[PDB]
Amino acid sequence: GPMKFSNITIKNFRNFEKVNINLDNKNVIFGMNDIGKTNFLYALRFLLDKEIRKFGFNKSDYHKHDTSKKIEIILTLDLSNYEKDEDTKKLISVVKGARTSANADVFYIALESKYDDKELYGNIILKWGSELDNLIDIPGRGNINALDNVFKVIYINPKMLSYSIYNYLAKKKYEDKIVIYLIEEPEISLHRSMQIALSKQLFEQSTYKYFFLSTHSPELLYEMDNTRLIRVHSTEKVVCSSHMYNVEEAYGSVKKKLNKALSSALFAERVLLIEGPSEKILFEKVLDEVEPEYELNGGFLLEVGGTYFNHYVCTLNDLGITHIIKTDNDLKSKKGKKGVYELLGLNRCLNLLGRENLDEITIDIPEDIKGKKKKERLNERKKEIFKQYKNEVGEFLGERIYLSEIDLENDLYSAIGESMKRIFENEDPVHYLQKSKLFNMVELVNNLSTKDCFDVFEHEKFACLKELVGS
Amino acid sequence: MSREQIIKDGGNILVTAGAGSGKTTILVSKIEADLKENKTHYSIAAVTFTNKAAKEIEGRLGYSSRGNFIGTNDGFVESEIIRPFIKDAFGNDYPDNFTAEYFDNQFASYDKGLQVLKYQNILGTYSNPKKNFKFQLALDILKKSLVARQYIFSKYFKIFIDEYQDSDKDMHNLFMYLKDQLKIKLFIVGDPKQSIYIWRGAEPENFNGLIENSTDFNKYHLT
Amino acid sequence: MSREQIIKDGGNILVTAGAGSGKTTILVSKIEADLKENKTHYSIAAVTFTNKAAKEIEGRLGYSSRGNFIGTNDGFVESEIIRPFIKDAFGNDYPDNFTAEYFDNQFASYDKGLQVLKYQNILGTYSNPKKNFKFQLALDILKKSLVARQYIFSKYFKIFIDEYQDSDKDMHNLFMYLKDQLKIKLFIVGDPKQSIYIWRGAEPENFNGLIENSTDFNKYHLT
């Protein structure tokens, strides 16, 4: 693989006590603690940009203003594909020596700084090379370091004209050096469509490579592909989590909706996954009637539709975001019917915990049986298979995965029984609600009372909302 | 017109120049043209025994941000290939900084030279005036170190070689190793009539063979 | 109370400490106190053979803008006195950068050692285990170079000396030359019962004579 960033071990910086967060060329930093993201970007500027090193470090630049500690930010680089990667050649041409033949792939770039009290100016002492144990003397011919011929920081901070012309300027002038775009909040004066355009040029075109993107709007993350997403936790003590966000060719067709839905959820402290928009309407009504500040204390309703949760689960778990999923046990037929049914409702929850896909179970449904009787038989079979796999359901509850008894609507009817009958005035309100999920769900929500909302919220079969709200 | 042939260049270029210098102006023109048309991080290396030639080359050329090396072959090697990578190739025990004195050892066996270099830090030459041990050491350090090969590949895309008739088999092997095993372009100019340093150790017969037997290096005639 | 005597210090201080280290804490306290009360550009030099002692001294001490040297006596000399001023004192012909190997020459005559050092670049020791040639070379470079004397005078106002019973006549002469001919304060601590490195070349009889015959160095007793 081409040359890629690997890790940065920021220690005793303005806010970073001791963090070793992985990197990979295309980087995205977001989340809480805007000062944390700003400090991370300025740490990269200190490690790579000469325009920031010359000012040195101050008393405030250290962690808790404690001048005793030493700033040590160590960028880690991975080198491979020497004969075809131009940037690898750019990095290894300037470095003369200090590269042990044992490990020609790893390359450290550290930055040691100790504060002196006789002058109140912490000197930036670059010490880069290939091994942490042994460092040779850096040339440092005056103000320009040897690193200055390799890594030049192009700082973008607000105007689409500048973004459009930086491509031309770098292509025609900065070919020799490696460009590292440290973009900090480019959504300041860009429209939603402008944010989409900038995301398309960033995450798809090769003109922006090795870029560190700071964003606060989900629109800038609509085209994420093989990047490294970095999320800063909400605590004042900065904790950052990293995840390779790459879409498989299986999800390539649905990549647009996948990214559009996941980008908004990336900024939520707690994310709840749902299948259909009727579930969205019901959960939104319940939350608005019990806790309208769910979006405030950290919450989201991620509508995934079909596909699988595997990509969503990996992305949400790697960033450390609270993981909540409520799903419906659905038995879908495939190829020849009448005895062939998959277990997507359960096959998913198995795939989230790994294991293996269940075989296509066979249900003996007579041909003459149809309509209400067929649905009753399917519900009985779903109840039987749910009662059979009690251990798997227990593991899902232990791993914050919620699976319905048969379907979501049956759980809703169990939580509130008389309210459904009063609203729909039918002997079988569940069947009527399944007849047209959207319109009937809207009608149910419009006539849904606050007491009914509280009963739904406090029921154990709807514990997803309780987990989303939190303490 | 030979000026058009000089401008059009193309890959490796061999020019049969005359005496009374002459090679200096075409060397300067080629260096300037290569620096001008280039738009990447690739550097250039021009090497010449004559120290005042290096001084005038540096004087008539401007300051370059990218490192361009002007010096002598032995100085070139001992500066960038031996000095940095001697510890990496042969362990931390080998010294990194040293001075070259040809009239210290005067040995007869290669093994004895190896022992005295390893232990007593002394670096000299063979009793035989032919051949230079420095280029053999450069070959040895290049062969068993991938870092040195990568650095030489990435740094210089075309190495300029001057007064190649003075070259013996050792730096000939070094230059061919850089050209073939490293796919690095070479710009070599030499005078067939300048075979006067034979007693010093020069054996141009390999250069004449490359003129005749080799086909990659096109031959050019300069008036 | 001996803490008051430690704090009040005053000029040169000689302390008859016991075994089981002990000297390390008083050394650290004296170094810290001298750095704290000082308000000028004068530096300090603490020297110790034990490498891990130097490592812990550096670790427990903070970063100092003014250059404070922590190392071994031979390393101290070969670092600041020999390496920079060897070209100034003995001409540009003498090498500046070199490595010390004691087991190379094993000579018997001083003139032969001088010739081999001048020509073959090799630096070793006498066949006699007593005495060190490095400190004699330091004396020689100090005697005929005013620049070195001025640098030593201006840089360090008090040089701290540790495990002085290991010292032989050569570094004894160097330290006395710095104390008398350069008027540089000396802080020396030594254990009379630590005479175990005699075979290595240590001859503490001069130290005992300074304890008895000399009057400038006041003797102090530590519990």
Swiss-Prot record, chain A:
Residues 3-237 are annotated as: ATPase domain. Disulfide bonds: none annotated. Optimum temperature is 37-42 degrees Celsius. GO terms for molecular function: endonuclease activity; metal ion binding. A divalent metal cation 2 binds at E279, E409. Residues 266-406 are annotated as: Toprim domain. GO terms for biological process: defense response to virus. ATP binds at D34, I35, G36, K37, T38. Endonuclease activity inhibited by all NTPs, dNTPs, NDPs (at 0.5 mM, UDP not tested) and AMP-PNP; not inhibited by any tested NMP, dNMP or nucleoside. Inhibited by 100 mM NaCl, 100 mM KCl, 0.5 mM Co(2+) and 0.5 mM Ni(2+). Its EC number is 3.1.-.-. It comes from the Bacteria. Keywords: Antiviral defense, Endonuclease, Host-virus interaction, Hydrolase, Magnesium, Metal-binding, Nuclease. The record marks K96, R99 as: Interaction with GajB. A divalent metal cation 1 binds at E275, D359, E360. Disruption phenotype: When this gene is missing the Gabija type I system does not confer resistance to SpBeta in B.subtilis. Rapid, sequence-specific cleavage at physiological concentrations of Mg(2+) (4-5 mM) or Mn(2+) (15 uM). In presence of >20 uM Mn(2+) has rapid non-specific cleavage activity. Its cofactor is Mg(2+); Mn(2+). Homotetramer. Forms the core of the anti-phage defense complex. Interacts with GajB; 2 GajB dimers dock at opposite sides of the GajA complex to form a 4:4 GajA-GajB assembly (GajAB). GajAB interacts with Bacillus phage Phi3T Gad1 protein; this interaction forms a 4:4:8 GajAB-Gad1 complex and leads to GajAB inhibition. The N-terminal ATPase-like domain seems to have lost ATPase activity, but may still bind nucleotides. The C-terminal Toprim (topoisomerase/primase) domain probably has the endonuclease activity, but when expressed alone (residues 348-578) has not activity, showing it requires the N-terminal ATPase-like domain for function. This is Endonuclease GajA. The gene is gajA.
From Swiss-Prot, chains B, C:
The record marks V147, Q150 as: Interaction with GajA. Belongs to the helicase family. This is Gabija protein GajB. Component of antiviral defense system Gabija type I, composed of GajA and GajB. Expression of Gabija type I in B.subtilis (strain BEST7003) confers resistance to phages phi105, phi29, rho14, SpBeta and SBSphiC. Expression of Gabija type I in E.coli B (strain ATCC 11303) confers resistance to phage T7. May be a helicase or contribute to GajA activation. ATP binds at A17, G18, A19, G20, S21, G22, K23, T24. Residues 1-223 form the UvrD-like helicase ATP-binding domain. Disruption phenotype: When this gene is missing the Gabija type I system does not confer resistance to SpBeta in B.subtilis. When this gene is missing the Gabija type I system does not confer resistance to T7 in E.coli. Homodimer. Interacts with GajA; 2 GajB dimers dock at opposite sides of the GajA complex to form a 4:4 GajA-GajB assembly (GajAB). GajAB interacts with Bacillus phage Phi3T Gad1 protein; this interaction forms a 4:4:8 GajAB-Gad1 complex and leads to GajAB inhibition. Contains a UvrD-like helicase domain. Coiled coil: none annotated.
